[PDB]
Design a protein around this ligand. Structure first.
Ligand SMILES: [Zn+2]
Ligand SMILES: [Zn+2]
Ligand SMILES: [Zn+2]
Ligand SMILES: [Zn+2]
Ligand SMILES: [Zn+2]
Lengths: 292, 445, 417, 196, 355
């Protein structure tokens, strides 16, 4: 039908990749992933002649517009392959080596924040840019190494929600590929379910070629005539603000609107300092009255 | 019907000849480009595992909403002999063509290509200045030759013979002149890759043993080729028709190094606007387009006035209309050009009028013509007033009896495609002279 | 007024009115109280906003307007009377209402009356038409002329009121009671006819002024300050919003219900940069077709599972007998109504609610037994051919109902036991 | 003609009664009608009792239909004797003095619209002969009287009035008038120093 | 010379948006749009007529209001022929009011308005409304007058006493009584009686009315509210729903009383408790966390970068179009500034910059 603007974000982080390859033994698994993605973009740009690809990597200190080159020469790959495929693959391996050399250079400083949401947002802006230029399908791909330490998704939660709402406005499914020890990533699973995206988690770096060639090929040209393969289901619930556990039925502030599994101490808001009404909370604490 | 015509031709190509075509990765890449999305997905899934599948697994995977499209994809898949579906263990065991499979695999991996993507010399030069200019020159010469406006640079004698034999732009030997057939105007209406594909289909049809699969593989890799580089001059049949398509201006060859122009790229794939025309009830032309080719083709069916930078003006006359009509050029062809040359403001006004008339009545009691009938139906009324009769000439069988027999004989002619007209109420029908003998034999039996 | 919960429950006539308005409300109410015998106050206790909305919809009335000015004279004339406008004329002109009520129920017909009315000069007088002795009017309607005149006098007497001195033109002209000048112009004074009498334009102008005054006093119905009046707001301070901003302190609890080292990650990083600059092969990515076959098995299993999920993608089409379908829908509906009312009683939390809770518990038990007996009926009507589907269709409301019963029993054992 | 019946459908109509008391009740009615916003129209003589001490503002002073030149009654021997005496005394042109008095009565009629600078209003001149009298007219009045406005018809009068209403229906930034129209104490100080 | 006019227009525009505040703004909303369908809106004076455009704009308003703020109920009462007619009760489903408005499409606007009756029955409809819900009414009006049965000032006093605000979008010009309503209801503010100048301005006004409004400190109602996240099931068997009493394949399940529903964000029909998703509550967090404006750096000074930080394009070169996020110290293009300030609700420069 139409050229599908391909959007691929690769979450590269040595804190995750070192953790994964030390947990297992597949050194160069990230290289295997990169080669698989090279074949994936080849299969995509051979599926359609103009389904243009946006490739962005988010490193530890920030993000990088990988494909294409900025608005401001060895060949590792073979010379017998296709021209456009070779140009893209050579450009990406050059950009990847430059980013990895940079990452080796500035390895020793510490930044504990994931940049996945910012990378996703910048990619969505570029999707707006491409779609506003000249009619193009929007499909967003994330590659993550989930074997790293799940430190704090709490600050990541809000912009991820904002990105979900934006992609909902933009009819862009958010398809998730996870490689890690943890089977489940709740926010990503919720993201896939809300955006009609595809969630998938495995561990072995082998067979990802067949995995994301078979499953991760759904385009908006043929989305309604393809069943989604996701098996997990999400309650769309959140952990409590002061006890950190998910709540089924509970309480939220009339002002801050944060989930309270229990009564806040001092009857004041733990988010926006609103003192509440004692008769209200006593009625909330009321037991039912039962006949003797 | 370009993919339909090529797929039909390859289905006409036998199974092992198809398998010979499926040997090389460049041919497999071009054919994969031809395949529809469902079959494309199927083969890219199965190409990386040597696990044959039964049809039941694919059927369970397939959502039934697009099951007709799935049927089309697998019908093409089987009829191209790209599949080997056998009822193994009672189940229709699905198997891709293995030569196609491995050649696609090597093309995707960048593995063994045997320079099917091209025997490369890689002496790149500028193409906009030599290749594009010579290409535009030669294509301009053949295009104005095909227009009929006078031009000195005649085409090759091979293509001249192909035009003489073919029903495209008839070089009528009684007149000694190339003459616009209705098929010639179809070619004029065609897209550029459509014109190239019609030309190569006709040349492949006329050419015989010159190895047909050599021409096929060479055509597929020539489509697969890239612009602006020198390459090694391969099969000799491929080389001599390569020199032929050099004389067509497709490649810029320095008699061994050859430099393929942009025409190979357009043959491979496609790449208040230009070509947008404002219609007028006064038949005035407000074209947002200009070329000497545009004037040359507008000379056939439009009375023009002058040439300016984008502003080509004129007035469509009924003399111009009937000049188009008397060439055998179809009014449907004319409105094909017209409806491919519409303008934004007028089509927005037409859609506003359509949405206004939608709420009043579904039929609107108006003729079905979306382009504004104030100007557009004036041609369409002239289109209906052009033909406006039905002529039947030759044999005719009359005064049938039993209606039975009349329906039987008439139905039989329709089945064999020799029936030209019938009337239940008079129990009469007309059949072509070719089918006369067949109908008579059936009547006796 | 008619706005309390007691008033809305009291208005049985209005309750019957929107009852008769709906049809599923006869169905529901009939099952609720005619069939199940629920307290109809508690029936209407849920539908209180609906009752008040119906009341307020029925309760509004229009504002006054110049109905005689909207009357047009329209050869011949055909009466095209509108009853709402006839009552508008009645309300605007009680004299015309009186002239209707003492003549039509006594002497002649309504359309004959209105033809006489349009013929009458009293109609012209009450409208913006100057009376003329050339017009004959209608004698029966024009007998009310002096009655309308003394109505006008009484109404003007009513309309008289004292005036503020801040705007009192009478005080303004009573500034100097001994002004001795010259007689003002005939042009700019109220002109008269030849014989000194007026034409009556002052009468028609004071009449339309009386119409305006009657308007504004109809507005002014049952349903010092000059300091505020003379304020010059243009030289005053601009109003500023007292809207409160909000901050947000941020301290979230961690999610509740081995550690890597820089040396080791640096060693691996050095090694993988070495591998990166060393080599990269696309061709090695092809799997072993056996672990890949297990991947095929996993993928196809996921496809089968989610396809069976998608296989069950007006209500659904069903092969029920239509009567039993309606009966089971009805039973589901009244069970839902019972359950909602029982929850209303339970979440209320009073000792006054106790007998209500007990009785609704009994009703829920009765509904359970009736569901079971219905299951016996579809049992011996189907041989459990699709009586299984009947049981499963009525299942989840039954599960919620019996869960509520268990909750009631548990809280009974909590408090009493 | 029954035009007043059409006028009934939009606003009330109030006429200057010869009784000042009924006129007072009438103006109270107009006041309350513009108070509730249902709208009303006053009909008063140019020299009539309303015109000499009653102001109208921000809904009361919004638009005025001045009807023609308010010339005095021409055939007054009293007026003619006045004209003769004042011409004999101060060499006064009689027609010019008549235009002066008409003039000044019209200004008295039209001066009761703008109470504060926040108010706004539109003025009409419903006579052909007014066009020669802008030089007569008061300076601040005529400074808003543009040269295109000297001879207008109903259509562009309506269009300009609608656009004026659209214009006056907008808020205004205080920065554009904080030093040129409205003055603070510091603004007056700065102006006084600038005078110094 | 058009760029100088554009620059001074942008300056006079940005003078209003210089002050950006984190006011407490209402989330539990209660919005009523009454419609008049009278003889005034029969004017074709704006194309095609006022009735058609207010229908279309109300469709858009319903969509935008339910998208941005799904945590409110919407009621519509039409005004026609001296009567105010309720056509849409307050509900969580926008589609009901969409269908009611589609019924309003084909019927004919005629009559005269009565804001007294309209606001009175709007008050009565707004009467059984909980405390946290912010009762506010949008009123469209085309007349310059209002026929009424009785006093409006008693209604004004009652509405002020019952803590309901109004905002009037008049058509022709200002009406003094509507100004009085807006001022007295709105604590003396004049920022609520708004008059359009064209249909584009009407569109902008409707978009402005979409947004939540700030609340007052004196109008203090700071409390908690009980909430419950339900669970969605995907069952093989169709099942009867509690709300519409019909067979449903799927449906959420009640967290408290374990019944099932058909739509969200809705309250329970059985345990009678509100059920939402965390997406719904996080939907207004841009209102809860506003975004600072981005400053163009001047063309005279030296520049940190010459191409856009976010969209990655070259900055064009008289003036300098480098909108700087001072919170992240990065300059951006106008397109990215628009997208981040309106569509997005995060600054990726501040996402990359660690705190
Ligand atoms: Zn809070
Ligand atoms: Zn339902
Ligand atoms: Zn519940
Ligand atoms: Zn940018
Ligand atoms: Zn920033």
């Amino acid at each position: 039908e139409s050229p599908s603007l391909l959007t691929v974000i690769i979450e590269i982080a040595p804190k995750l990749w070192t953790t994964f390859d030390e947990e297992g033994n597949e050194k160069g698994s990230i290289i295997k992933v990169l080669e698989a993605l090279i074949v994936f973009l080849n299969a995509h740009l051979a599926f359609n002649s103009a389904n243009k690809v946006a490739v962005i990597a988010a490193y530890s200190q920030g993000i990088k517009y990988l494909y294409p080159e900025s608005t401001s020469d060895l060949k590792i790959i073979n010379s017998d392959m296709y021209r456009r495929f070779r140009n893209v693959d050579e450009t990406l391996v050059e950009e990847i080596y430059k980013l990895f050399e940079l990452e080796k250079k500035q390895i020793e400083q510490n930044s504990q924040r994931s940049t996945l949401a910012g990378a996703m947002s910048a990619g969505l802006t570029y999707v707006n840019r491409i779609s506003k230029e000249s009619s193009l399908k929007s499909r967003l791909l994330v590659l993550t190494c989930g074997s790293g330490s799940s430190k704090d998704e709490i600050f990541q939660y809000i912009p991820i929600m904002n990105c979900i709402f934006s992609a909902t406005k933009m009819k862009c499914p958010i398809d998730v590929v996870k490689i890690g020890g943890s089977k489940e990533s709740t926010f990503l699973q919720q993201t896939t379910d809300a955006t009609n995206g595809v969630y998938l988690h495995v561990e072995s770096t082998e067979g990802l070629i067949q995995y994301l060639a078979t499953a991760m090929f759904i385009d908006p040209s043929l989305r309604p005539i393809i069943v989604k393969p996701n098996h997990g289901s999400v309650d769309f619930r959140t952990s409590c603000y002061l006890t950190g556990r998910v709540v089924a039925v509970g309480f939220i502030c009339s002002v801050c609107l944060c989930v309270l599994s229990i009564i806040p101490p001092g009857n004041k808001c733990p988010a926006c300092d609103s003192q509440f009404d004692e008769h209200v909370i006593a009625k909330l604490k009321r037991k039912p009255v039962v006949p003797r | 019907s370009l993919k339909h015509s090529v797929t039909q031709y390859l289905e006409e190509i036998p199974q092992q000849v198809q398998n010979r075509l499926y040997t090389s990765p460049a041919t497999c890449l071009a054919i994969y480009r031809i395949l529809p999305p469902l079959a494309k997905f199927f083969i890219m899934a199965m190409v990386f595992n040597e696990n044959e599948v039964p049809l039941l697994d694919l059927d369970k995977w397939v959502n039934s909403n697009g099951k007709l499209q799935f049927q089309n994809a697998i019908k093409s898949m089987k009829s191209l002999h790209l599949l080997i579906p056998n009822k193994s263990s009672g189940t229709l065991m699905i198997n891709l063509n293995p030569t196609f499979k491995i050649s696609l695999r090597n093309a995707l991996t960048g593995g063994e290509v045997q320079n099917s993507f091209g025997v490369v010399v890689e002496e790149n030069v500028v193409s906009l200045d030599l290749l594009d200019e010579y290409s535009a020159n030669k294509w301009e010469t053949i295009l104005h030759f095909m227009v009929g406006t006078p031009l000195a640079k005649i085409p090759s004698e091979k293509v001249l013979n192909l035009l003489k034999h073919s029903k495209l732009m008839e070089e009528v030997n009684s007149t000694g002149e190339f003459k616009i057939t209705n098929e010639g105007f179809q070619f004029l209406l065609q897209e550029i890759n459509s014109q190239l594909w019609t030309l190569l289909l006709q040349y492949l049809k006329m050419i015989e043993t010159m190895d047909l699969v050599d021409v096929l593989h060479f055509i597929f890799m020539l489509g697969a080729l890239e612009v602006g580089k020198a390459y090694k001059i391969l099969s000799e049949t491929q080389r001599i028709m390569l020199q032929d398509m050099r004389d067509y201006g497709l490649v810029f060859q320095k008699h061994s190094i050859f430099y393929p122009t942009k025409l190979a790229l357009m043959l491979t794939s496609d790449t208040i606007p230009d070509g947008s025309l404002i219609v007028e009830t006064n038949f005035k032309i407000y074209s947002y387009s200009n070329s000497p080719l545009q004037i040359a083709v507008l000379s056939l069916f439009v009375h023009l006035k002058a040439r300016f930078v984008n502003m080509v003006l004129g007035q469509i006359t009924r003399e111009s209309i009937r000049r188009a009509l008397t060439n055998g050029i179809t009014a449907d062809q004319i409105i094909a050009y017209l409806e491919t040359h519409a303008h934004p403001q007028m089509r927005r006004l037409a859609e506003e009028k359509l949405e206004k008339k939608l709420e009043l009545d579904p039929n609107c009691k108006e003729p079905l013509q979306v382009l504004p009938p104030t100007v557009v139906d004036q041609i369409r009324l002239w289109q209906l007033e052009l033909d406006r009769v039905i002529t039947y000439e030759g044999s005719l069988y009359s005064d049938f009896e039993t209606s039975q027999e009349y329906n039987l004989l008439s139905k039989y002619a329709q089945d064999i495609g020799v029936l030209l007209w019938k009337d239940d109420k008079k129990k009469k029908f007309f059949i072509s002279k070719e089918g006369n003998s067949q109908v008579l034999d059936f009547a006796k039996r | 007024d008619s706005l309390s919960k007691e008033k809305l429950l009291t208005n049985l006539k209005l309750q019957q009115s929107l009852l008769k308005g709906n049809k599923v409300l006869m169905k529901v109410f009939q099952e609720t109280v005619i069939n199940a015998g629920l307290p109809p106050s508690e029936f209407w206790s849920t539908r209180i906003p609906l009752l008040r909305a119906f009341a307020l919809s029925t309760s509004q009335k229009v504002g006054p307007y110049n109905v005689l000015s909207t009357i047009k004279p329209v050869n011949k004339v055909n009466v095209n009377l509108s009853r709402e406008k006839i009552l508008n004329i009645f309300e605007n002109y009680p004299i015309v209402k009186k002239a209707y009520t003492d003549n039509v129920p006594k002497n002649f017909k309504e359309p004959e009356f209105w033809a006489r009315f349009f013929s009458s000069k009293l109609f012209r007088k009450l409208r913006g038409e100057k009376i003329m002795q050339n017009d004959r009017g209608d004698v029966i309607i024009d007998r009310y002329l002096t009655l309308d005149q003394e109505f006008d006098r009484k109404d003007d007497d009513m309309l008289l009121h004292p005036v503020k001195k801040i705007i009192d033109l009478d005080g303004n002209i009573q500034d100097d009671p001994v002004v001795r000048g010259n007689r003002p112009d005939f042009t700019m004074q109220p002109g008269v006819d030849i014989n000194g009498n007026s034409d009556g334009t002052v009468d028609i102008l004071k009449g339309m002024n009386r119409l305006s005054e009657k308007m504004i006093m109809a507005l002014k119905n049952e349903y010092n300050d000059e300091r505020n009046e003379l304020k010059i707001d243009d030289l005053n301070e601009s109003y500023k919003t007292n809207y409160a901003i909000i901050h947000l302190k941020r301290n979230a609890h961690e999610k509740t219900t081995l550690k890597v080292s820089n040396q080791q990650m640096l060693q691996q990083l050095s090694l993988v940069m070495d591998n990166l600059i060393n080599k990269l092969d696309l061709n090695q990515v092809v799997p072993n077709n056996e672990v890949s076959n297990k991947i095929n098995k996993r993928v196809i299993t996921a496809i089968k599972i989610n396809a069976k999920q998608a296989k069950h993608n007006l209500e659904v089409k069903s092969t029920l007998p239509i009567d039993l379908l309606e009966s089971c829908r009805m039973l589901h509906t009244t069970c839902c109504e019972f359950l909602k009312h029982f929850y209303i009683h339970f979440q209320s939390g009073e000792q006054k609610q106790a007998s209500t809770v007990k009785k609704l518990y009994n009703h829920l038990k009765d509904c359970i037994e009736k569901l079971n007996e219905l299951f016996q009926d579809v049992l011996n009507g189907d041989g459990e051919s699709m009586s299984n589907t009947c049981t499963a269709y009525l299942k989840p409301v039954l599960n919620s109902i019996t869960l509520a019963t268990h909750k009631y029993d548990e809280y009974f054992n909590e408090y009493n036991n | 003609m029954g035009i007043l019946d059409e006028v009934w459908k939009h606003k009330l109509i109030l006429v200057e009664t010869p009784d000042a008391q009924e006129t007072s009740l009438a103006l109270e009615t107009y006041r309350k009608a513009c108070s509730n916003g249902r709208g009303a129209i006053l009909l008063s003589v140019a020299r009539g009792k309303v015109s000499e001490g009653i102001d109208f503002d921000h809904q009361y002073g919004r638009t005025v239909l001045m009807i023609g030149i308010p010339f005095q009654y021409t055939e007054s021997r009293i007026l003619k004797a006045r004209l003769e005496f004042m011409r004999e005394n101060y060499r006064i042109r009689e027609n010019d003095f008549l235009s002066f008095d008409a003039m000044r009565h019209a200004a008295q009629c039209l001066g009761r619209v703008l109470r504060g600078k926040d108010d706004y209003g539109v003025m009409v001149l419903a006579d052909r002969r007014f066009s020669r009298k802008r030089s007569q007219l008061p300076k601040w009045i005529a400074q808003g009287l543009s040269d295109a406005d000297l001879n207008l018809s109903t259509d562009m009068a309506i269009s300009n009035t609608k656009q004026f209403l659209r214009t006056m229906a907008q808020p205004t930034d205080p920065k554009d008038q904080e030093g040129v129209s409205v003055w603070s104490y510091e603004d007056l100080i700065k102006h006084q120093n600038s005078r110094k | 010379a058009s760029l100088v006019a554009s620059i001074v227009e942008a300056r006079k525009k940005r003078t209003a948006k210089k002050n950006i505040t984190p006011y407490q703004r209402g989330i539990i909303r209660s919005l009523i749009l009454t419609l008049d369908c009278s003889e005034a809106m029969l004017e074709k004076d704006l194309r095609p007529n006022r009735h058609a455009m207010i229908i279309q704009y109300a469709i858009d308003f319903v969509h935008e209001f339910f998208d941005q703020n799904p945590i409110s109920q919407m009621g519509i009462i039409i005004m026609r022929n001296g009567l105010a007619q309720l056509v849409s009760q307050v509900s969580g489903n926008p589609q009901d009011h969409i269908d009611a408005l589609k019924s309003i499409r084909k019927q004919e606007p005629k009559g005269n308005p009565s804001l007294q009756n309209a606001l009175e029955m709007a008050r009565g409809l707004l009467l059984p409304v909980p405390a946290h819900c912010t009762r506010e009414v949008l009123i469209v009006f085309g007349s310059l007058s209002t026929t009424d049965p009785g006093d409006i000032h008693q209604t004004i006093d009652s509405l002020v006493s019952e803590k309901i605000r109004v905002k009037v979008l008049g058509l022709s010009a200002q009406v003094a009584i509507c100004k009085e309503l807006c001022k007295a209801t709105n604590y003396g503010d004049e920022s609520f009686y708004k008059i359009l100048l064209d249909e584009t301005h009407l569109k902008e006004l409707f978009n402005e009315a979409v947004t939540p409004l700030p609340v007052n400190k004196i109008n203090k109602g700071f409390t908690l509210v009980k909430m419950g996240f339900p669970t969605r099931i995907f069952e093989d068997t169709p099942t009867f729903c509690s709300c519409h009493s019909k067979l449903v394949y799927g449906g959420y399940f009640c967290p408290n009383c374990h019944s099932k529903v058909c739509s969200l964000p809705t309250v329970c029909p059985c345990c009678d408790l509100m059920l939402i998703l965390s997406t719904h509550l996080a939907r207004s967090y841009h209102h809860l966390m506003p975004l600072k404006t981005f400053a163009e750096v001047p063309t005279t000074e030296k520049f940190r970068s010459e191409d856009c930080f976010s969209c990655q394009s070259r900055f064009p070169i008289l003036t300098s179009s480098r909108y700087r996020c001072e919170d992240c110290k990065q300059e951006f293009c106008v397109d990215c500034d628009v997208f981040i300030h309106e569509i997005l609700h995060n600054c990726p420069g501040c996402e990359s910059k660690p705190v």
